[PDB]
Amino acid sequence: YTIAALLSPYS
């Protein structure tokens, strides 16, 4: 299967 994940950390 195909899965996309996006994580953008902020301070």
Backbone φ and ψ for 5, nearest 5 degrees, come out as -135, 135
User: Which residue type, as a one-letter code, is found at position 9?
Assistant: P
Q: Which two tokens stand for residue 10?
A: 């902020």
User: Which residue type, as a one-letter code, is found at position 1?
Assistant: Y
Give 6's Cβ-side CA count (13 Å radius).
Answer: 0
3-state helix, strand, coil in the chain (%, to 5): 0, 0, 100
Q: Which two tokens stand for residue 9?
A: 């950390």
Q: Whole-angstrom Cα distance, residue 11 to residue 9?
A: 7
> Which method, experimentally, gave rise to this model?
NMR
